[PDB]
Amino acid sequence: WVIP
Amino acid sequence: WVIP
Amino acid sequence: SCIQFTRHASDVLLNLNRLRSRDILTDVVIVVSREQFRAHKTVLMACSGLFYSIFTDQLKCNLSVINLDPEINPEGFCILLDFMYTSRLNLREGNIMAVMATAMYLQMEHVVDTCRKFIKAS
Amino acid sequence: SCIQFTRHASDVLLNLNRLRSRDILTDVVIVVSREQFRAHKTVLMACSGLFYSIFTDQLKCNLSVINLDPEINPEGFCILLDFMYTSRLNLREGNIMAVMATAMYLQMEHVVDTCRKFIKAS
Ligand SMILES: O=C1Cc2cc(Nc3cc(Cl)ncc3Cl)ccc2N1
Ligand SMILES: O=C1Cc2cc(Nc3cc(Cl)ncc3Cl)ccc2N1
Ligand SMILES: [Cl-]
Ligand SMILES: [Cl-]
């Protein structure tokens, strides 16, 4: 999971 | 396009 | 000896979401309490262990309406349906409990994992 | 303020390809000369400008069989259908001309672009  |  | 187009899967998902927003080729209504959600059975199956089981069933595969368990929160479902079609999860303090419970019911293991991690941190 | 799961789109496409290989929820047959190819209309639309136009047509959207132009090569179509479901293109010296022509007809602009680049190099 990432910060888009 | 890449070499997978 | 194939070549690969890096953005292909993302572009496919983006177009499937555009079809969903325009209600094109949607073949099922998911009923969550009073709320109705139109979707594509194949996308639901690709994202959820529960929908995979439902639509591979020789009788349920032909249903145009699926009613979820009355404990399922319509907002939690909406957040998860958006994630299915975009890869983006709107996880907030006020919805994390409903999102995790809905993801456990829908059998969306990666969402369950991040919810457990975010709850543990707080 | 969403979070994003990097592998989600690829995982969705992988599961849609698994449904295709097992002939699950396929809703159309594409006929190319004597050859038949089963697929999901939504995936074809998401990948091809031609299928997007066909299945948004109020009459054609309801057809279970689509016949392609007799000039279309079944092998070129097969390579392109595999690319639609995997992001992987089996581009070879012996098939590049048939793949480019089929991609131009199907309106798959990124495939047309790499075929033109590969032809130019040789
Ligand atoms: O967390 C999850 C997400 C998920 C998706 C699917 N859907 C498929 C799985 C296979 Cl092997 N082939 C085809 C499909 Cl559509 C099943 C279980 C789960 N669990
Ligand atoms: O090279 C290409 C690939 C492609 C795909 C689609 N399919 C869509 C486009 C839009 Cl805007 N919304 C929804 C869909 Cl399914 C149309 C044209 C082309 N050209
Ligand atoms: Cl997931
Ligand atoms: Cl393309």
> Which residue type, as a one-letter code, is found at position D21?
S
In sequence order, the β-bridge partners of residue C16 are none
Nearest chain A Cα distance for residue D40, angstroms: 29
Task: Determine the Cα–Cα distance for residues C60 and C54; give it in Å rounded to an integer.
Answer: 6
Structure tokens at C31: 């009923």
Which chains, if any, share at least 3 CB pairs under 8 A with chain B?
C, D
C118 lines ligand 1 (CB under 6 A): no
Cβ neighbours around C93 below 10 Å, total: 8
At the second CATH level, the architecture of D1-122 is 2-Layer Sandwich (3.30)
Task: Determine the Cα–Cα distance for residues C31 and C70; give it in Å rounded to an integer.
Answer: 10
DSSP annotation string for C8-65: HHHHHHHHHHHHHHTT-S--EEEEETTEEEEE-HHHHHHH-HHHHHHHTSTTGGG-SE
C53 lines ligand 2 (CB under 6 A): no
Domain ranges of chain D: 1-122
For ligand 4, an ion, list residues with CB under 5 A.
Answer: D 108, 110-111
Task: Determine the Cα–Cα distance for residues C119 and D50; give it in Å rounded to an integer.
Answer: 46
Task: Determine the Cα–Cα distance for residues B2 and D59; give it in Å rounded to an integer.
Answer: 39
Nearest chain A Cα distance for residue D88, angstroms: 24
Structure tokens at D53: 């136009």
Q: Structure solved using which method? A: X-ray
Residue labelled with tokens 């969903």? C20
Residue C39: partners with Cβ closer than 8 Å, 6 or more residues away? C20, C26, C28, C29, C30, C81, C84
Interface contacts (B, C; CB < 8 Å) = 12
Resolution of the model in angstroms: 1.9
Q: Which helix (H) or strand (E) holds D38?
A: strand D35-39
Q: Is the CB of residue D17 less than 8 Å from the CB of residue D10?
A: no
Q: Hey, whose CA ends up nearest to atom 6 of ligand 2?
A: D49
Task: Determine the Cα–Cα distance for residues C92 and C118; give it in Å rounded to an integer.
Answer: 10
Three-class DSSP category at D66 = strand
Q: Hey, whose CA ends up nearest to atom 18 of ligand 1?
A: C49
> Which residue type, as a one-letter code, is found at position C33?
S
